[PDB]
């Protein structure tokens, strides 16, 4: 029963680290997308 | 998609320059046409 646990279950020690890392990366990626969508507003200064 | 954009779309950077240049040229050409039409009034001074 212990040898099976070694294969099947997850260790919350590492799992919470992975989750927090992925969450901060999600925030960063959302900011990057929000900036990428806006990165073209400068063209209007040419046209106006 | 980016490789296609490189071939198909236009860059407003250069396009606005081309457009403004052509517009100023149009104004100058219109003035030149007006002066060309008017450049014959001086004959009347002979006849009068």
From Swiss-Prot, chains A, B:
It comes from the Bacteria. Residues 9-48 are annotated as: Required for interaction with FliS. Induction: Translation is inhibited by translational regulator CsrA (at protein level). It is found in: Secreted; Bacterial flagellum. Disulfide bonds: none annotated. Interacts with FliS via its C-terminal domain (residues 537-576), interacts with FliW via its N-terminal domain (residues 1-44). May form a 3-way complex of flagellin, FliS and FliW simultaneously, in which FliS and FliW do not directly interact. The chain holds residues 529 to 576 of 576 of the full protein. This is Flagellin A. Disruption phenotype: In a double flaA-flaB deletion, cells grow faster and are non-motile, flagellar filaments are non-existent. The gene is flaA. Heteromer of FlaA and FlaB. Interacts with FliW. Interacts with FliS.
